[PDB]
Every structure is written in structure tokens, then in C-alpha cells.
Symmetry: C3
Subunit: 406 residues, 3 copies
């Protein structure tokens, strides 16, 4: 008599049991977030670039011939544009070296042009301090970006015993004072991908083993300010194939020997430009010929402009399994003060005007809670499934012992 | 003999079993946080407002009569305040149209005043680019806030095939150059909720289907800078009644057909002002009469000033079950450079002074890890409880088989 | 016959069972993150400091004698440095009170010097508003930092019924307008830890019961801007000994009666300076003698400079079990506008130049989602282990009933 709903007690097992086994096959994960004060923490690499690509005093006669149009300094008939914009003192200088009567074109490449005309760390870096220790231009590695000759502090390449951070605050990080040298900025007479309307620098904080994409990803620092950048290192760990679609951390993709989102982007930005312009830009890796100024203006610029703005399809990247993110909070105070302008003016052999317009202090450091791990953890292991459907079996063929008793 | 602590083995079951069943009734939840590089991602809406509400050249004789006191331009006896502050060239203009001898008041409402005197996108927008494509004032929807005539890029209303983002960097987002038109700013002679001491604009990044609250929630952008806004879309999902107290996402509340915190706030800001001033402000929805300048100064301003600063009680909102947050990291570089000022001066038919004081470049884009889900997941399902108290029952009436054996 | 792999079915139990018991001993935890719109939320404390330590008009003859070298105003032979930098009008004033012929040294201590020469809230605070209510210098508590005489709004010490926040937006928070008084800045003739090249203020948002470390942790606010600081309170809860190594929240460590990272840092910064200079700095607690200017320059500065930049070893802190973090997003607009400069100039009895160079508006408020809890939760309780190894036992000595049946 009392056994009709005992096979109905089998119906309860089925419904409850069949969902815990479906839940496993969804392969669900939870998140383990730990914000903590670390010790012996590795300091990131800091890349920076002047927003002006070429120093006006270094642009030679041959430099202007090959690259003039690309820099919007010459029209098509190799002369100064009909318009343009002043300048009483500069137009004298430029038209003198725009005189091509007497001139025969000499060999030219953009990498050497960037390298020589590009702004120099040795005259930009007025002051460097990391953790009490004073750094020099030696502590900065030259790296080429779409901006030109750029510089990486703490690149930590070749034997260099990487710099560590212990606690929070400005003192436990990097401080640099810079002269952006506005009096060396190329006159802007038109708009091209090489000229800008802005004075200042671009900065990007990244892992030593991930290349910069400062054109796209970087932050700006304005001249005539001290800028505080309070940071936090975020370690993001993901789960392999069955739970999430991450690509393996330890390589292995193309021109760089560490897989990251940025490396993957530059990888096929190189492929794309080679497969379309027969040409690579200055900042791209590989061994293809460097783009000639004519190829930059006709092919290489629009090609990369297409990839970084229009493309929805060609250069897309998978998620790596390890990602380092840098949370940052920015802040400014004015430099110089009325009470200090004259000091710095004298100290660096400069006008008081100049100091207010060119001088810049950068502070990169971490806050107290400097380290964050965001790791995806498995929610239902195989053993926990068996221990749940097992203890589910012995509940309707094991806890029936107390219902038939009553 | 060996059965005295077997009912003491029942005591172990009770203590361990009664806490796993209490743990279920706490209804606990965990968090699933996923920061990832997305694809086919929806671009937010961008609302912006000039901090000056009314263009000085558009304030007519009738405009000054009705709204003069509210704008701190006239005292109570309809004349220019006894003090005030200059200006040799402006006081000539204002006192000419402050001459009310010969004048008879004409019909007036604030919405039309805002609409006509309000700053115009067509003369503010000097440059617009989204993802390589150039935008025009057509791509901006006019929206009224407490600031006045404001504008929303990518409002995505009425058929408009919403704009998408693929990757990280400035190129995959919006860039706009603006003239805030300081020479059109109303003279500030006193302090009111309509005048400000600041030049610049207010910006707010929000969902297409959530209204702006830019007065309260927005960020500022200063003139004479290029400002980079690196973003991250954060999707926050919460749990319904038993686990958390969220209100349903899909409606359904009052003047807007999507429930959000901002919509809920404006909802009863409208109710409150109607139920206290017999009046609605220009930016509020519904069908009540628009506030007259006199009602603004006497009733509507203090009423809303009470709600947004003092009120602890009247207009409080429940959490929605879906929230879109935008993490943002701001950055500046100077505009113009010494080497480009003259170009832009000529390009827009303006003084070099003007360019340094009025011109502004805004960049809104997402970083590489553009998308974040913060979803609350159930920690103890009903099936996992049964599989644990079941496997708990068969441990003291099932693993006694190995203790009586020894 | 059908019993050879039944002891092989014992092998399955062993492998699956021995990992769920190893998983427990790893003591794993998950994370519960809840971003929500709060109510009745406690407003933080806001500390700020002028970047100039000593007001030029308050530096007396005796002040210059004792502290002159430390301030880089005097060389070693008690005279004005041979160089230095101007100033036609200031060098007249300073050399008059640098005349020590006729002068006999009087008693001196840095705390009184900071207290008297330090910038005064009563002449810096031009405007204060919190949630519609106007605040005065009374609402600001004087606190000494390495900057000098600094000020804390909403310190909430001694009976003060702490201020609350309800919703998001500028209105539900603090707004302050400041004159940093650049015309009162001490001339900078050299570089010391007491002089700076920057005009502006340092700000830090912290818990009422945690001291400031504004030198290290604070953010800057530049003069001639309105700065918006959109905030979010983050409550971080950690797990005691067995799961994580947190130190107890409710005390109990040294000079402050609440354990926090900042309190712990100042604790042994005090110990260190006492145990090395026989000396404490002005901002440090305890009862040791205050450092004399000579001791500052010779001992106390380099000692603390060592701790905040070089030290990897001496002053390291454990994690507390409760931490309050403040996420912040910064933003600027220009002050004053061309149309308002003259008003403020007149209002505060100042030059139009002065207003552009000294005036500053600060806005501290929370966004809509103002409150965040990041709490570490236990992943495998003891009861859930037993209910899993129990339901694991009764799966190979309980679900064999269906395999021997077939
Ligand atoms: Cl790409
Ligand atoms: Cl409200
Ligand atoms: Cl320390
Ligand atoms: Cs450009
Ligand atoms: Cs490789
Ligand atoms: Cs206002
Ligand atoms: Cs509705
Ligand atoms: Cs200093
Ligand atoms: Cs204590
Ligand atoms: Cs379980
Ligand atoms: Cs279980």
C-alpha cells in the first residue's frame, strides 16, 4: 500500500539529480579577487614619446626633400604650400633649405630619420629619480613607435636586475622632469598622421614582456603641470579550453616570444602592411623593407589607419590566459609656481616663459593596496558532482528508512 | 556495549547537518567577474553641454525682461544691478537692450529660450570623427538638461543602426574638436543656478536607453587641452527577490520605458516639482506647464536644489537588476602647440588668443580589456543541499559499517 | 566472478575521495563583490595641504635664523646664497630680516613655526558647501603632516554627528573654493624636502579613523581649475589566519587606537626616527622631543626619505582584516571664465591675474553606485566536505546495487 509514491520518490530523485549533472556540463566558474598590499613587487616598464616626431633643427635639406610632403611642409611641386601659416623667423629658415636648385637627392630611410631627427632623451630628461636613486638617460631603452624615437624606462632587457617596489606612495616609484622642447616642434601647415595640434607627451605603463601600443592605448601628460599617476597591478588569470577560451600564456606567436593582446595586434599589422604595400613601417618587426616617405603617404598610413579604426574583421585577437592590467588614477598640480619659476629658468639656462610652456613633472607609483589578483576558479569539480549525486541516490534509497518507519 | 556513542554519532550528524540547512536559508551568493576583450561591442551615448547656458548675442530684449533677474543681470526694479562688474564694451550693449521705456512684454517660455539662445552644435562642432568616419551635427541629438540645450552623440534613437567597437585604442572610438565660444558667455554679475564661474563643457557617458543626469553625474573637460578618456563597459547583474532585492530590468516605471537609477530619479523630480510649484522645468518629461522665469527663481530651483543636495527621504530608488557602468581613466595634453596655434587660428578664422582659450579636443574610446561582467551567482542550489544532507545521513548510518567492523 | 573490479570500484572511490579532502586543506576562498546604490552612507574625511609650507609674510627674523638653511634661504655662513634667483622687490625684504647684526637667537620649535607661518584655512577657504549647507573654517580640523599645517574636513572627532550621503552627484557631496595664495609662497632658491616647484594643493580621501599619509598617497589639485572627484567607497573584508593572513581590525597597535596600513607605517616611522635621530618630526605622535631645524636637515629628513623610498625591510605592515578604499575618477574645467573673472576679482578684492593663478574649486562626491563590498567567502566548509565524502562512500558501497543487478 505505502509504496505507490516510493516510485514517486524516484521522481524527486530524477528531477533534482538531472539538474546537478546538467550544471556540471555548463562548466561554470566563479571569481577569486584579492586586493592586497604586496612586497617584492616588480615595477612595470614606462614608455613615453614626444608628440612632436621630428626636431626642427635636425631636419636637413635631404630630409625635407624625401619627407617634406608627408610632413605637410611641401606641396606636390616640391615648394612651400601656397598658403600657409607665418612665420617671419621660420619661413626664412625653411625656404632656404627648401631651395632645391643645386641639390641632388641622396639615399634616405625613415628609421635613420626618426633616429636622428627624433627627440633625444639626453636633452629632454632634466631629472630622473627612482626610489631615491637618480637615473640617467642610460636607464632608458630606445624604442620605435608610430610616434617615432621613444623611450622605455625599466625595459628590463639584457641582464638588468629588474627594479622592485615595496609600499605605497610617490617615494616608492619613478619621478621624471621633462623639457618637451616646443621651440623644436616642426611647423604645422596641414594635417597628416605625423603632425599634431598638441604639445606634451604620450605615456603607457606595461609589462616588460609586452610591447607598447602607445598611439592607441597610452595616456597624455600636459606640459606645465606635475602629474601624479597612482597605480595598481591587476593580475587576471583565466581558464583553459573547457571552461573558457584562453590561449596559452607561454608563447608562441610570430615576431615576439610572449603572447599578449598587443603583440598579437602588431603581429598582423606587420603582415597586413607587407601583404598590401610591399612595405613595413619603422616600428614594425620582421625583415621587410622599411617604408619610403612616398609609400607612407600613399599606402602605409591609410593601411594602418584602416586597421586601427575601421577594421572589424582582419586583425582580431584571442584572449591570453594571463593578462596584466594597470589601474591608474591621474592628478595634477601646476608647475612652475610664481615663487620658483625664476630658479628653474636659471637652473636650465631658459626663459621664464619657456619653463611655463615646456617643463613637466611625471610621478608613477602604486597606492597602498598595490596588487590585485582576479583568478577564475572552477565551481563544480568532478568529485563534487559524484559526492552530490551519490548523496542524492542515498537520500531516496537511504532516507526512505525513516518514512517507512512512520 | 559499543552502541552508546552511536547515538552520540547521531549528535555529530545533527550539528553538521543543521548548519548546511541554515546556510541554505541565508540564501548566499558569490560573484563572477570577467574582464575580457570583446568584439561587436555597442558604443555608449555621449551627452555634452556648454557650461554657459545662453549665448550673449541671442539674448533679445524680451529675453532679458522675463529672465533677466534669474540670470542675475537685473535687480528687482528691472535695471542693471547697482554694482556690478565692468565691462566697457558690454555694458554699452546690455544697457541698450535693458532700456524698457518703449517696450511691452511679449509671450515667453524657457524651452524656446533655451532652444534659441542655447549654444549651437553647428558652430561648436569644428571636427567630428568616429572610427575613421567623419560625423556632422546630424549625428548629434538635441537633449535638454538643467544646463540647457545639450547634445547626444550616438543616441541611437529612431531606426539608427547603432555604432559598434571592436578593439582598444583612440582609433576605435570618438574624437571631437570644440569651440566653447567664450566670447558668447553671458556676463556673470551674481550667483544663480544658471550662471557659472567656469569655462568648459560637461560630458557624461551612458546607455542609449538611460537618460542623462549630467548636472550631477557628468565629468568636465577643460578648454585648451586634448582630453583622452579610456573606458571599460561594466555589466552588473544582480539576483531577484529571494537572494537580493533588485527591481525587474524590463520596465516598468513612469515617463521612460526602461527602469534605471537615473530614470527613477528624474521620474519623481518631475512629480515633486509638479506637486510643489504647479510647474515643471524644461528638461523634465510629462505634460505639466513649463516653469516661468519667476517660478524658476522662486520655486523650481530651490525645489530641485533640495532634492539633489538635502533630501534623505523623498526621492530614493531601488536597485535595478541590470546596470551598465563605465569605468573611465582621464588624461590631458595641451592644445594648441606654439608650432600649430597659427594654423588653427587661420583655419577657423580666429585670433591665436581665441584658439588657446576656446579650443578643445575630446577622445572617447575603450582600452583593450573593454568588457566586464559582474554577475551574482547562487552559491547553494536546492539540489546541492539535498546531495549534501543525503551524503550526510549516509555517513553516520552508512560509514558506521567500518567502525563496528573495528 | 563479477567482484574483481568491485575492489577496482574501491580504486575509483580512493582517487576521487582523496582529492576532495586535499581541496579542503588548501583552505580555498571565493569572492563576493557587490556594487550597489547605498543609503545613509558615511562621508569620508578630506585632508588637504597647501604645497607651500610657510607663508612668506609670517617668516620672522628668528624664524629665518633657525630654519633658513633648511628652507634653502641661507648658506652655511648665515647669509643669502651667493647666486641666487632675483627678486628686485623680495630680496629687499629678505636681506633686511637676514641682517643678524643686532640679533640674538630666541627659543624655537618647528611645531609652533608650522602652526604660525603655516597657511591659514580662514584666509584660504573662500567658499565651503556640503549638501546645501554652508561650512566654515570651524568644520575643518587642523592636522600636521610632512607638508605642515593641514586641514581635515569631516574629521568627525569629538561628539560631531558624522555627515551622511544618500545619492550620486555633485550635490550630495562637498564643494570648496580656495585661494592658494601664490603671493605668499616662500622664494625657492634651492632644493630641499620643504620647498617645491609646484603651486596647488595635495588632497587625500580617507576613513575618519585612519590618519593621512598625504605626502605619499594624496592626489593633486591644480589652481585655475574646477576639479570634479567622483568617488566610490570600497569595503574590503578578508579572512582570518587559516584562510588568509589578516591582522585583527579592532586594534591594537601603538600610537593610534585602530589598526590600518597607514597607522602602522607612521607607528614605526616614529620609532625609527627616535631610535636614530633622538628626535621626532612635527607630524609624528608620541612624546619625544620635536626635531630642531638642524636635526631636520642633518638627520630627520634623510631618515624618513630612506623609509619612504629605499627601505625594503624595516617598516613593512601586515594586511588588516577591514580596509576602506576610495575609487576616484578625476575631471577638470577652467576657472575663471572670461565672462566671470572680473566678478570674482571684485568679490574677493583681487587682481584678475590673481584669480586666474590662485583660485580653485574642488568637488568631492560619489557616483550613483556609491558602495562596493569585496568580501572573501569560504569555499568548502567542514560540513560540505563530510556531505561530499559521505555521498562518495555511498556511491561505491551504495550504487553498486544497480550494477550487480545488471
Ligand atoms: Cl589592429
Ligand atoms: Cl533626487
Ligand atoms: Cl615606511
Ligand atoms: Cs595626427
Ligand atoms: Cs616568436
Ligand atoms: Cs551654478
Ligand atoms: Cs513608461
Ligand atoms: Cs620637495
Ligand atoms: Cs594604541
Ligand atoms: Cs557539495
Ligand atoms: Cs555533496
Amino acid at each position: 500500500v505505502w509504496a505507490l509514491c516510493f516510485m514517486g520518490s524516484l521522481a524527486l530523485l530524477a528531477l533534482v539529480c538531472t539538474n546537478r549533472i546538467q550544471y556540471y556540463f555548463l562548466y561554470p566558474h566563479v571569481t577569486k579577487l584579492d586586493e592586497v598590499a604586496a612586497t617584492r613587487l616588480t615595477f612595470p616598464a614606462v614608455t613615453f614619446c614626444n608628440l612632436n616626431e621630428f626636431r626642427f633643427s635636425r631636419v636637413t635639406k635631404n630630409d625635407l626633400y624625401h619627407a617634406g610632403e608627408l610632413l605637410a611642409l611641401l606641396n606636390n611641386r616640391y615648394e612651400i604650400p601656397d598658403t600657409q601659416t607665418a612665420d617671419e623667423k621660420q619661413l626664412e629658415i625653411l625656404q632656404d633649405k627648401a631651395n632645391f636648385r643645386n641639390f641632388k637627392p641622396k639615399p634616405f630611410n625613415m628609421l635613420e630619420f626618426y633616429d636622428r631627427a627624433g627627440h633625444d632623451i639626453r636633452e629632454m630628461l632634466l631629472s630622473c629619480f627612482f626610489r631615491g636613486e637618480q637615473c640617467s638617460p642610460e636607464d632608458f631603452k630606445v624604442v620605435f613607435t608610430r610616434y617615432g624615437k621613444c623611450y622605455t624606462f625599466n625595459a628590463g632587457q639584457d641582464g638588468k636586475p629588474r627594479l622592485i617596489t615595496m609600499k605605497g606612495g610617490t617615494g616608492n616609484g619613478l619621478e621624471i622632469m621633462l623639457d618637451i622642447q616646443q621651440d623644436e616642434y616642426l611647423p604645422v601647415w596641414g594635417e597628416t598622421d605625423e603632425t599634431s595640434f598638441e604639445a606634451g607627451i604620450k605615456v603607457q605603463i606595461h609589462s616588460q614582456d609586452e610591447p607598447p601600443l602607445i598611439d592607441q592605448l597610452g595616456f597624455g601628460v600636459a606640459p606645465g603641470f606635475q602629474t601624479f599617476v597612482s597605480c595598481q597591478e591587476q593580475r587576471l588569470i583565466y581558464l583553459p579550453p573547457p571552461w573558457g577560451d584562453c590561449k596559452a600564456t607561454t608563447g608562441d606567436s610570430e615576431f615576439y616570444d610572449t603572447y599578449s593582446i598587443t603583440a598579437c595586434r602588431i603581429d598582423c599589422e606587420t603582415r597586413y602592411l607587407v601583404e598590401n604595400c610591399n612595405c613595413r613601417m619603422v616600428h614594425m618587426p620582421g625583415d621587410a623593407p622599411y617604408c619610403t616617405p612616398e609609400q607612407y603617404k600613399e599606402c602605409a598610413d591609410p593601411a594602418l589607419d584602416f586597421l586601427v579604426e575601421k577594421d572589424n574583421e582582419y586583425c582580431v585577437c584571442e584572449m591570453p590566459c594571463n593578462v596584466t592590467r594597470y589601474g591608474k588614477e591621474l592628478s595634477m598640480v601646476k608647475i612652475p609656481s610664481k615663487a620658483s619659476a625664476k630658479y628653474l629658468a636659471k637652473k636650465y639656462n631658459k626663459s621664464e616663459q619657456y619653463i611655463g610652456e615646456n617643463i613637466l613633472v611625471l610621478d608613477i607609483f602604486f597606492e597602498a593596496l598595490n596588487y590585485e589578483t582576479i583568478e577564475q576558479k572552477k565551481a563544480y569539480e568532478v568529485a563534487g558532482l559524484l559526492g552530490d549525486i551519490g548523496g542524492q541516490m542515498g537520500l531516496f534509497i537511504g532516507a526512505s528508512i525513516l518514512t517507512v518507519l512512520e
